[PDB]
Amino acid sequence: ADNKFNKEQQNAFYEILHLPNLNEAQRAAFIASLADDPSQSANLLAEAKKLNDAQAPK
């Protein structure tokens, strides 16, 4: 009925996997949640990027 996101899902997937500082376990979780509900993609991206930022060599 109401289309919301198309390629953004796949982009989100890519972004989460592209995060270099993202812990494997965490990435696995975010992917699992994204596959579970692709509508969480942006929030998963947010948290993943936050964690990637936190786990960055600062």
Identify whether 20 is part of a domain: yes
Identify whether 45 is part of a domain: yes
Can you read off the two tokens belonging to residue 37? 């509900």
Amino acid identity, residue 22? Answer: L
Identify whether 38 is part of a domain: yes
Q: Nearest Cα to 39, choosing from 17, 16, 1, 8?
A: 8
Identify whether 2 is part of a domain: no
Identify whether 41 is part of a domain: yes
- Tally of domains within the chain: 1
Asked whether the CA dihedral 4, 19, 26, 55 is positive or negative, the reply is negative
| 34 Cβ neighbours under 8 A, 6+ residues apart | 9, 12, 13, 16, 40, 41, 44
Method underlying the structure: NMR
Amino acid identity, residue 42? Answer: A
- Taken as a whole, the chain contains a residue count of 58
Which residue range(s) make up the domain with 13? 8-54
Helix 24-36 vs helix 41-54: crossing angle, to nearest 10: 170
Q: Is 57 exposed, middle or buried (0-12, 13-18, 19+ CB in 10 A)?
A: exposed
CATH code where residue 23 lies: 1.20.5.420
